[PDB]
Design a protein around this nucleic acid. Structure first.
Length: 271
RNA sequence: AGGACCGAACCGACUAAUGUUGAAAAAUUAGCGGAUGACUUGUGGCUGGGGGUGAAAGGCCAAUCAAACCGGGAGAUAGCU
RNA sequence: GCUCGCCGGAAGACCAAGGGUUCCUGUCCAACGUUAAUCGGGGCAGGGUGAGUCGACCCCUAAGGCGAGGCCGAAAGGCGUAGUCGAUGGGAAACAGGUUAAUAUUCCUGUACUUGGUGUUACUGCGAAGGGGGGACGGAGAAGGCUAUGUUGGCCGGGCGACGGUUGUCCCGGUUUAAGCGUGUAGGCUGGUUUUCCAGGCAAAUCCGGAAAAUCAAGGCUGAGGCGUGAUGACGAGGCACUACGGUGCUGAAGCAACAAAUGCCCUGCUUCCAGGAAAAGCCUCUAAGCAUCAGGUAACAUCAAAUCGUACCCCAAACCGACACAGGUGGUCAGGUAGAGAAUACCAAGGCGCUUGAGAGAACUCGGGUGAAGGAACUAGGCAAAAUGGUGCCGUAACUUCGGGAGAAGGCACGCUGAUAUGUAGGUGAGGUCCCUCGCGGAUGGAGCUGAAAUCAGUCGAAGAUACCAGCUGGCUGCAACUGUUUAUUAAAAACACAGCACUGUGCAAACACGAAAGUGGACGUAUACGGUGUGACGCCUGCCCGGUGCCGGAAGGUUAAUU
RNA sequence: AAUUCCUUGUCGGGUAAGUUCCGACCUGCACGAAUGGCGUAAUGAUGGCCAGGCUGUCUCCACCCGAGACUCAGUGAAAUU
RNA sequence: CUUUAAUGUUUGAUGUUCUAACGUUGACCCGUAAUCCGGGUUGCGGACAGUGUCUGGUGGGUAGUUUGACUGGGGCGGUCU
């Protein structure tokens, strides 16, 4: 659910919460956890490659099955769980064979729902089948880009891919960005939309929240003594030059796709 | 419940006076701000010089920073004292 | 040595880091000590540090480091797999008393405990570089039950007062005792037991997990403290023999109860929230490869080993970092009494210092402070500074407002002491006794005793009763920024910087981007409700016209147009 | 007006008197709507202004308590030249 | 020798298809109790991508420098034969 707190304190006026009592009020399944230490935006060389990364509440990783390769074995859900590594929720499933796994939560899934992966699976939210068997004009998530590696597309809170056409060994899709892409007609795609749609409605209401997520403050650059930034400074707020990133790139229209390796799977890039 | 409140420890450093070859190569006394947090601290580790880092001041990087220190090219050049 | 003074949440006590003999004793006084110096953290000599249980080493691992191979790189060399290192973390074991001039839970006494090795006896399925369980973990809040500690009484011992009174409801001192062993309570978690079956736990599996039936509801685990033992002891205020008043032998009475009570223990818990909260090993189990009248494993006893290094002293300081015996800085633990909300603050105990130049005089003037005639900001850039305000409870509290606030608005009233209501009340605690029992650390009754507010009435003293330290000045208009916060260490705390939110734009994953000649890493073990960049800067009303120029995003006919030919 | 040169713009408010301050006027030398515009409760060791209260801030200083200064003994610098 | 079509060969361009180089930060197997690497099998792309040399454009992102003299101070103006 969604709820807007009371302005009993400054910084609580506009903060909005996404409360969902369906989540698990306890610890997750340890066998599916591992070590994940914060990075700080630095690399093997120690330099900060990406900025605005630092601190944040401690986090444990959830071993999520982005492949769903346990075909022909129904699995029932047990509980929904919070995952900080991603914006979407996850549900602790239980296969008939006694094995447990983590997956993404579809739009209207609940505890006790049955799911089956493979080609002989039913067409209902949560099941996984190759796209060669999915009806055209349907909705899917956790889509794969290559057979056998695991879903990569539509893994966000309320994101979904909509299958729109099929001609041969490939199937065309409309991604949440509006792009029109075509991928092999053998990749696995789960039905339904990832259910956390109300996540985009969450309001932090104060700066400290962005620190819990690990977002360090972002200084503009308009006043950045010119040695640091092309925007530089000047007596007052002059800013009389084009918008440019550091290292000299526009940032306000310059398209920077230099792949030229696919040239086949793009149809309607966007806009 | 709170980046809530009064207020010590604790972290700060707004003003004043003293001190200005000082007790101190930036402190002291009287008051002051914050004080469950974007807090603070210990131990160890990573980022190295046109580079690092920076809630950004051209600030910090061993009392030294509009480009650290050491040694070297080097007895640089110096139509200037 | 007798006094006075100072800290006493330290200016006391115990350590890490660091220092490295500054430790104790004797001797010495050139130099060092901001003076003298018989003294000294000074000089010379000598002595001093005792561990199976504390710590390190060691076992395991984190961020991270090196890195056989190997990938990459003009050379140097760089990253990194398997692995190996790396604490600030996890991992078996000792408490009290006594003792040295200087060392201790290290030595002595007493009482214990732990992990291994070997051997003996009996019963036996034992086994890993594997599997699983466990270890294993967040913040906040809430009480409840306890202890350390403290208070009073009782008891024991002594005392009868330099000056009125002091054989009493008087004064002083003491009333301490551990780990360990057994008891397994308050209370927390959890439904157990027996068998059959199974796509999973990389192979196997009696253990994990899963599934279907049967059967009893009490089963087990965790767990402070209390109680008993440990302890016919030890310690013990004081006495008694040696007694150089330097000290040693023996002896040594009472050693209970009640109340209060922690920020610590039960609690790695309970409750709740979103920011969703380390790893590996040891340990407990599972079997595989393999070995079985073996080896191995288990229970009991006997016995052996538990090495090596460190331990002195200072450690908020005169011994570390600051050139000084420098008003500085420096992490962790212990946390007494009265008043108090309190680790504030004031006076004190234990304990430790009086700050390594003193004396006299009592001028200007400076520094740090007290007070003030009448006036009360006229001083001044400016109420700078100083003064004043200051607490508890009740009454009361405006425009505005995002309806939370503003607000402790402003303002007003009473605060002491004695007695009584009540020989000390409400209330808390709770004994004996009585009764019950699944007979225990039980339950209920019971209300002793202890403890202890607040309120009113009356009376009383004083100039003044929140008498001291301690402890908000308030109100009105308005600019800027929303606010909390943040920055020029060492002249700039601000209207700048950040900020939640909004917007444009890029990015379809071998993502853009960034670091790197490269491999490759971060971004991210993320996937457009996402990441990066730019601008603006809560929120509310809004964000208007112009694409000529620059740049960007696009297109097509033609013209120009490189190497190459 | 944190922007207004002429300028102490005019009027009014408050003051015995107000180049600052508040409220309107608009003749914008030279505001302007995300290098954001107009407002904005609340916050503020923020900038400016007006009151109450209290004050040695002043009229105008006076006395007292201490530490130096001054005298005596001991150790014994400095910048400058 | 003045001329014009299917063909043989020549090469040149557009397009379709394929695989044998190449790629694979796709799956699986082995070295091997190893998310590296290598090899192997298979699958998807496929002469594209990518790299190298030459080359046009872009390029304050990063460097090395220049930015005159006279002058009733300099600058501005003005002048320089």
């Amino acid at each position: 659910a969604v709820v807007k707190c009371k302005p009993t304190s400054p910084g609580r006026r506009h903060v909005v919460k996404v409360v969902n009592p369906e989540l698990h009020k306890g610890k997750p399944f340890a066998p599916l956890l591992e070590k994940n230490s914060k990075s700080g935006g630095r690399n093997n060389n120690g330099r900060i490659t990406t900025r605005h990364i630092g601190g944040g509440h401690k986090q444990a990783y959830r071993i999520v099955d982005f492949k769903r390769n346990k075909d022909g074995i129904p699995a029932v859900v047990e509980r929904l769980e919070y995952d900080p590594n991603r914006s979407a929720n996850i549900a602790l499933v239980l296969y008939k064979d006694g094995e447990r796994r983590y997956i993404l939560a579809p739009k209207g899934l609940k505890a006790g729902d049955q799911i089956q992966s493979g080609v002989d699976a039913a067409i209902k939210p949560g099941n996984t089948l190759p796209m060669r068997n999915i009806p055209v004009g349907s909705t899917v998530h956790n889509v794969e880009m290559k057979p056998g590696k695991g879903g990569q597309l539509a893994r966000s809170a309320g994101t979904y891919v909509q299958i729109v056409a099929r001609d041969g060994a490939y199937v065309t899709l409309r991604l949440r960005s509006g792009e029109m892409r075509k991928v092999e007609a053998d990749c696995r795609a789960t039905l339904g939309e990832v259910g956390n749609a109300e996540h985009m409605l969450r309001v932090l209401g104060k700066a400290g929240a962005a620190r819990w997520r690990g977002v360090r403050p972002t200084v503009r650059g308009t006043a950045m003594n010119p040695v640091d930034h092309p925007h530089g400074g000047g007596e007052g707020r002059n800013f009389g030059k084009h918008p440019v990133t550091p290292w000299g790139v526009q940032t306000k229209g310059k398209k920077t796709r230099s792949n030229k390796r696919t040239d086949k799977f793009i149809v309607r890039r966007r806009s």
